[PDB]
Amino acid sequence: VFDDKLLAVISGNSIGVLATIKHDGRPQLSNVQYHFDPRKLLIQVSIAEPRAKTRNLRRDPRASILVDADDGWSYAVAEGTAQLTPPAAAPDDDTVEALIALYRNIAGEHSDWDDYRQAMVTDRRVLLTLPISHVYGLPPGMR
Amino acid sequence: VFDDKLLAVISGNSIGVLATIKHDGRPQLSNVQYHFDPRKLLIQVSIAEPRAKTRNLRRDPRASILVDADDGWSYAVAEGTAQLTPPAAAPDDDTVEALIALYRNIAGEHSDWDDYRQAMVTDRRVLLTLPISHVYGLPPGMR
Numbered sequence: 001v002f003d004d005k006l007l008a009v010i011s012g013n014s015i016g017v018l019a020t021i022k023h024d025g026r027p028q029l030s031n032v033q034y035h036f037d038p039r040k041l042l043i044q045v046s047i048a049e050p051r052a053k054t055r056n057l058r059r060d061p062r063a064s065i066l067v068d069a070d071d072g073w074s075y076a077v078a079e080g081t082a083q084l085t086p087p088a089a090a091p092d093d094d095t096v097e098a099l100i101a102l103y104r105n106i107a108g109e110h111s112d113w114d115d116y117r118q119a120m121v122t123d124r125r126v127l128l129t130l131p132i133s134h135v136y137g138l139p140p141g142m143r
Numbered sequence: 144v145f146d147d148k149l150l151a152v153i154s155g156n157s158i159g160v161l162a163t164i165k166h167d168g169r170p171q172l173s174n175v176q177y178h179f180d181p182r183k184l185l186i187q188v189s190i191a192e193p194r195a196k197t198r199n200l201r202r203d204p205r206a207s208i209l210v211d212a213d214d215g216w217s218y219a220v221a222e223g224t225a226q227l228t229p230p231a232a233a234p235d236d237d238t239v240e241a242l243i244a245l246y247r248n249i250a251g252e253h254s255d256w257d258d259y260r261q262a263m264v265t266d267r268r269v270l271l272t273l274p275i276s277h278v279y280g281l282p283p284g285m286r
Contacts, residue, residue, distance in 0.1 A: 015216070017160045017209055019170040027162040027170035029209040031218045031281075066160055066172040077172045137173075 002041070002132070005139035006076035009069045010036050010043070014106060016067040018045060020082075021060050022053040034065065035105040042131045043078055044102055049087035049124040058084070063130055066137070074140035080133040087124040091117035098127045148282040152212045152219035153186070153275075154179050157249065159210040161188070163199035171199055177208070178248040184275045186221055187245050192230040192267035200225050206273055212283050219280040223273045230267040234260035241270045 010016075016034060019027045035044045043065060050057045057063075061082040068075050088095040091114075099120050103110055110116050119125075153159075161175045173196055177188045186208055190197045200206060204225040211218050228238040234257070242263050246253055253259045262268075 017172065019162055019172055021168065021170065025164065025168060026205055026222065027164065027207055029162055029207055029220045031216060062169045064170055064172055073174065075174055
């Protein structure tokens with residue numbers, strides 16, 4: 001279904017442009033760090049619980065992330081309907097535990113897990129899981 | 144002021160991620176080459192009529208462009224309402240002249256302007272002018 005060349009771009013990077021839908025219908029853009037599960041074909045990112053115009057994400061979870069290739073203009077865009085965990089509220093709740101696994105997948109073992117836990121709570125962190133439904137873009141070539 | 148920091152990010156780059164809105168309301172992402180006019184605070188890009196982004200802009204002109212700072216992580220996002228010229232129809236029309244102006248600003252003096260003129264018509268090129276109405280993001284020093 002998906003172009004392996006585009007999936008390779010996603011696999012060879014760890015940051016991209018996340019796009020969600022604001023109340024007025026306009027996309028909200030940001031540079032985020034992500035984890036890509038190549039078998040389950042899903043992308044995971046950590047965000048603070050949205051507020052104001054960005055909160056619309058809660059009622060319309062359609063999202064996309066653009067990832068840059070290593071050549072001149074190539075890029076891949078993963079599209080899907082995001083699933084969100086409730087915001088982190090306790091240093092040991094299910095959400096934080098899930099965010100610890102995400103951190104491990106993206107950066108590895110943290111130096112002060114206790115600091116991390118409180119940071120997640122202070123930022124009302126949400127783990128956004130985006131199962132990939134559509135992949136498009138411009139595939140890089142032999143180089 | 145703070146906006147000056149976001150505008151400096153935009154002024155210091157020539158590529159960004161354009162987000163248009165699909166027929167169904169979902170964001171559509173792609174990258175684009177651009178020229179920033181500090182004089183009128185405009186972002187100018189060359190797009191082809193048949194492309195998805197152009198068709199999206201013809202129905203809903205709202206657009207956003209995210210640009211990375213020189214650190215590749217900090218960024219700025221320009222939000223505004225796109226103004227599109229009709230597609231180049233004749234080698235000497237105003238749309239072509241506007242595209243010649245853009246080419247000079249982005250790449251410099253073309254070797255064969257007559258060839259460029261023909262090319263713009265063949266590709267149904269359009270000049271996208273995005274006056275920056277609002278800017279947001281996390282400029283250097285905030286990440």
